Symmetry: C4
C-alpha cells in the first residue's frame, strides 16, 4: 500500500528517509526494504531516466559552450568588433555568465530551504556545495572583469576546472560509474586530508631543513625547495638539484631520509585505505549510490 | 552420453559452447565431471597436437610478416625475399578475413553482446580489415598503407596471446586481461578523460601564448604526469604563477585519488572470485576451441 | 576502585601502563570496562585541554625555531657580533628561545630516564618518542657547543635537529583517534615490514653497483658512491640506462642493468603484496589497542606532571 | 627418537629432506611434534653456531672478492708494492673459493642425482651457487687466454654471489620466510608474467620501427629500449620526429602505455588474490623445510 509514503502533503516516509542528515543512524540501507526499492525503480524507469538524461545533455552542452567561449578569449573589458567570431564569443560568454547566475540562485534557494546542519554540509550536500562554489567563482570572475582587472581570467579558469570536474554528478543513473564516483567522494572526505596530515608536515620539515642548509643560490627560498622536495612524489626527483652549499654529506643524508620516509608514507596510504574490501565494501557503496539516486529522483519529481 | 558431440540435430557441447550472453550458468555447467573428463580426453587425444601445430604456424606467419614489414624500402635475393614475405602476409590476411566472415555468417550475434563474446574473433577480423585496407592503399598510389600496416602488425603481435589457452596459468592470465579490459577499461578511462580534459582546458585558457598554447600540447603535457614524467615548469609564458601551480597540484592530487580508487575498486571487489570464475571461464574457452577445431 | 589510580606506591593503572613490553598481553588489559571508562573520563575531564595546550605550545616553539634557523646570517666563522636592528634583535631572541627549548627537552629526557628506569634493552622496544625527543635535544646542544667553539658544523647540527623535530611533531598525534591509529600503523610498518626488505634491497644494490663499477673503466662514473646513487635513482623512477659509455661490452652493461631493474621492481611488488597480506587483516585492533595504551600512558604522565 | 636421524640404511629425517618435491605434502609433514621439536633442539644446540661461522666466512670471502675485483689493473704483471701482493692474494683466494664451490656443486649433483625436471622446482640455491662457480672458472680461463671477456665473466659471478647471499638469509625466521616468498615468485610466476610483457613490448617496438623511416632510433634495439624505458617511469613520448604522420606514432605509444599498465595491474591483482590467504602458513612451512635440509646437510658434513 502507498498511503502517506509519498504524498502525505505533510511528511512522507520516502521524503524523510531521503532528506535525513547524518544523524539518522541506519539510513544508507534503509532503502533496502522492498516497498521503497521497487517504487523508486519504477518511478525512475518511467520518467526520471528521461528527465535526467535531458538535463545531463543540456549541462554538457553548456560546458562545451563555456569552454569554447573561454578558450578563444582576447589577449578589460574588450569591445566586441564586427565579425562572426566576435559575435559567437560574446554570446558564448553571455550564456556562461547566465548559467553562473542560475546556479547561484539555485544554490541560494536550496540553502535557504534546507538550512544544512552546519556540520554535515560537507559530508552531506557535497555536490550542491561544489556547484555553489563554481557559481561563486564565476560570479567573482565577472565582477573582476567589469572592474578593469586581469584576475577575471584566473577566476574563470578556476570555475571552468571546477565545472569540468563536476561532471561526475551525472554518473548517477549508471550503476558502476555512479558507484565509482561515490567511491571517489567517500575516499576524498575520508583520507584526502588524513593521509596528507602526515605528508605535508614531512615535506615542510625537510624543506625547511634543506633550505637552511643551502647557504646561497637560486634555491635559497623556501618555496623553490618545497617544490624540489615535492617533485619526488611525482617520480621526478633530482638528488642533485643544487650545488651551492657545504657539508654535502648532510644534504644527501637528508634527501635520502625524505625519500625513504615518504615512500613508506605512500606505502601506508595505498595499503591503509584498503577500505572494506569484500567484507563490507561490495554492498556499502551500492547502498550509498542507491540512496543518492533516490535523492535525485525526489528532487527531479518535485522540481 | 548420446547426442553430445555428433547428432546432426543438437548437442549439449554444441549448445553450451555456442550459448549467448543471456544464459545464467554456462561456465559452471562444464563443471560436471563427465563433461570435464570428456573434453580433457578429446584434448589430450588430438586437439593438443592440432592446437600446438596451429600455434607454431601462426608464430611463423607473424615472423615472416614482421620481417617483411621491417625491411620495407609505391608500388615499387633481398627484393625477392621481401616480395615473397609480402605475398605470404597477404595470404594470411585474406585467410583471416574469410574466416571472420564465415564465423559471422554462422553465428549472427545478438548485436549487443558482440564485444563480450568472440573477443578473439572480432579482433582477428579487425586486424584482417586493417591489413586489407593497407594493401588497397598500397596499390592505390598512396602512403597511408604504412600506417594501416603498422596498426595491423601491432594488432597481430598482441593477438599472439590468443593461443595462451591450453595452458593453465597463461590462459587464466589472458582471460583476466580480456575481462578486465571489457568490463573495467571504461570504469577508469571514462572518469580519467573528463578530469584530464577539464584541467587541460583550464591550463590552456590560463596560458597567454606560446608553443603549449595549443590544446593538444597542453593536454599531452598534463598526461605526462600520469607516466611519472611530469615537469611542473613546462611553460613560463603566462602570468599568475600561483594559479598555474595550484591547478597543476590539484590535477596531480585528483589523478592520485582516481588511480587509487581504481585499484581499491577492482581489488576489493574481485580479489577472491578469480580462482574459480577465471578458471571456469578458461575452461569454457578451451571447450569452445576444442569443438571448433574438431568440427573444422 | 580501590588501589586503581593513586596509592602513592602502586596501583593497577601505574603498573599496566609502565609494564615493560616483555609482558605478554599488556595491551588487552586496558580494554577492561572500568579501565577504559576511567581513562575516557579523565581525558574528557581535563587532559583534553592540557594536551591541546601542550600541542599548541610545541607547534609555536617549532615555528619560532624554524624562523630563527632560516634567517641564519651567512657570514662565516661564528660567533656573530650582533648588529643593532629589529630583525637582528628578533633573531637573537629566537635563538635564545630555541636553545632554551632544547635544554628543557634535555632536562625532560634525563628526568624521564630515571623516572621509568628501563632495563637498557626494553628501552629499545618502547619509548621511541622519548629517545627521539632526547636525541633532538642532544643535537641542539651539540649545535650550540659547536657554535661557540668557532666551528661552522653548527649549521649541520641545527638542520639535523630541525628536521628531526619536525618529524617528531607527529608525537602529538595522540588524542585524535583516526590520526593516532594512522601514526601507530606508520610506526608499526616502519619498524616491522620495512627493514625486512631494506636489508635485501641494500644487498642487491651493493652487489649490482659493485659489478657495474667493476665493468666501468674510468671517468666520473668509476667511483662507488656515484654509481650507487645512480643505481638507486632507478628506484625513485629516475633511471637513466645510458649514464656512461666509458667501458667495453655494452651487452654486459645493459644486461646487468636490466637484471637489476627486474629484481628491484619485483622487490617492490613483493613489498606491497607481503605488507598487504600482513597489516591489513592482521592489524586493525592490534593498532587500536596500541593507540589506547599510548593515550593512557600520556594521561598518566600528564596527571603525575 | 629411534630410526629418525641416522641409521645408514633409511631415516625419517633423511628420507623426508632429500626426497623429490613430487611428493604431495612435504611442507605439512614436519609439523608433527617430535621431528620439529628435536630439529629445533639440535639446531639451537650447535647448528646455529656452525651456520653463523659459515655465514661469516662467506661474507669475508665476498668482501675479499669485491676488493680484488674493484682494483683490477692479460695476464698482468706485479710491481714492487704491497698493493699488488694484496691484489694477487685476493685473486688467489677468490679463485680457490670458486673452485671449492664448483666441487661442492658437482658433489651434490652426483650424490643426489636430480630428476632433470626438479632441477629448478627445488635445489634453487645450489644450482645458483654452481653457476656462479662456473662463471668464475670461465673468467679465469678467459683471463689466461690473453682475452678481455674475463671482466664480463667476473662481474657476472660477483653480482651472482652478492645476490646469492640471500641463501644465508635463511636461518632467521622473518628474513628467511621473506626470501622464500621472493624465490617462490621468481620460480613459479616470472615466466608467465614476463612472456606476455615481452610479446607486447616486441610487437609495439616492431610497429614503431616499421613506421620510423631513418635516424638513430631506426634500429630495433633502440626503439625497444625506449619502449622499455616507458616501464621505469622514464618515457619520453617525443623521442623521435623523423617519421610519417605523428598521429599513428601517438596512437601506438598511448596504446602501449595503456596496455602495459593494464598488464601490471592484472599481474598484481592475480598473484595477490591467489596468494593472500596461504602465505601466513605455506611460506613458514617452506622456510622450516629448507632449514631442515640445511640442518641435515651440516649434521652429515
Ligand atoms: C628510525 C625510526 C624507526 C623506529 C620506528 C618508529 C618509532 C616511532 O617514532 O613511533 C613511535 C611513536 C611514539 O609511540 P611510543 O614509542 O612512545 O609507543 C611505545 C610505547 O612504549 C607502548 O605503546 C609500546 O611500547 C608501543 O606501543 C610503543 O610504540 O611515534 C613517535 O614517536 C612520533 C615520532 C614520529 C617521527 C619519527 C622520527 C623519524 C626519524 C627522524 C630522523 C630525522 C632525519 C633528519
Ligand atoms: C584546493 C583548491 C583547488 C581548487 C581549484 C578548482 C579547480 C580544481 C577542481 C575542483 C577540485 C575538486 C575536484 C573534485 O573531486 O570534486 C569534483 C567532483 O569530482 C566531485 O563529485 P561531485 O561534483 O560532487 O558530483
Ligand atoms: C588505440 C586503438 C589502436 C590500437 C592499435 C593496436 C595496438 C593495440 C593492440 C590492439 C588492442 C588489443 C588488446 C588485447 O589485449 O587484445 C589482444 C589479445 O591479447 C587479446 O587476446 P585474444 O585475441 O582475444 O584471444
Ligand atoms: C648472466 C647473468 C645475467 C643476469 C645478471 C645477474 C642477475 C642474477 C641475479 C640472481 C638471480 C636469482 C634471482 C634471485 O632471486 O636472487 C636471489 C637468489 O639468491 C635466489 O634465492 P635463493 O638462494 O635460492 O634462496
Ligand atoms: Na615513477
Ligand atoms: Na620519472
Amino acid at each position: 500500500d502507498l498511503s502517506c509514503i509519498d504524498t502525505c502533503e505533510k511528511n512522507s516516509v520516502l521524503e524523510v528517509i531521503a532528506y535525513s542528515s547524518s544523524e539518522t543512524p541506519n539510513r544508507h540501507d534503509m532503502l533496502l526494504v522492498e516497498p521503497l526499492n521497487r517504487l523508486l525503480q519504477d518511478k525512475w524507469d518511467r520518467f526520471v531516466k528521461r528527465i535526467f538524461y535531458f538535463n545531463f545533455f543540456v549541462y554538457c552542452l553548456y560546458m562545451i559552450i563555456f569552454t569554447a567561449a573561454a578558450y578563444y578569449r582576447p589577449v578589460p573589458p574588450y569591445k566586441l568588433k564586427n565579425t562572426v567570431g566576435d559575435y559567437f564569443r560574446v554570446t558564448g560568454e553571455i550564456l556562461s555568465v547566465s548559467g553562473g547566475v542560475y546556479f547561484f540562485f539555485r544554490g541560494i534557494q536550496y540553502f535557504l530551504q534546507r538550512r544544512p546542519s552546519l556540520k554535515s554540509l560537507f559530508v552531506d550536500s557535497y555536490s550542491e556545495i561544489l556547484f555553489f562554489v563554481q557559481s561563486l567563482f564565476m560570479l567573482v570572475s565577472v565582477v573582476l572583469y567589469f572592474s578593469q582587472r586581469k584576475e577575471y581570467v584566473a577566476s574563470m579558469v578556476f570555475s571552468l576546472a571546477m565545472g569540468w570536474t563536476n561532471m561526475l554528478y551525472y554518473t548517477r543513473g549508471f550503476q558502476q560509474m555512479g558507484i565509482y564516483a561515490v567511491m571517489i567522494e567517500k575516499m576524498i572526505l575520508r583520507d584526502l586530508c588524513r593521509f596528507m596530515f602526515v605528508y605535508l608536515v614531512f615535506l615542510f620539515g625537510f624543506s625547511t631543513a634543506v633550505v637552511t642548509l643551502i647557504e646561497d643560490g637560486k634555491y635559497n627560498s623556501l618555496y623553490s625547495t618545497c617544490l624540489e622536495l615535492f617533485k619526488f612524489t611525482i617520480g621526478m626527483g633530482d638528488l642533485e638539484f643544487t650545488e651551492n652549499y657545504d657539508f654535502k654529506a648532510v644534504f644527501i643524508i637528508l634527501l635520502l631520509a625524505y625519500v625513504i620516509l615518504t615512500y613508506i608514507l605512500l606505502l601506508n596510504m595505498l595499503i591503509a585505505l584498503m577500505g572494506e574490501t569484500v567484507n563490507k565494501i561490495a554492498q556499502e557503496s551500492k547502498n550509498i549510490w542507491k540512496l543518492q539516486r533516490a535523492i535525485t529522483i525526489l528532487d527531479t519529481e518535485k522540481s
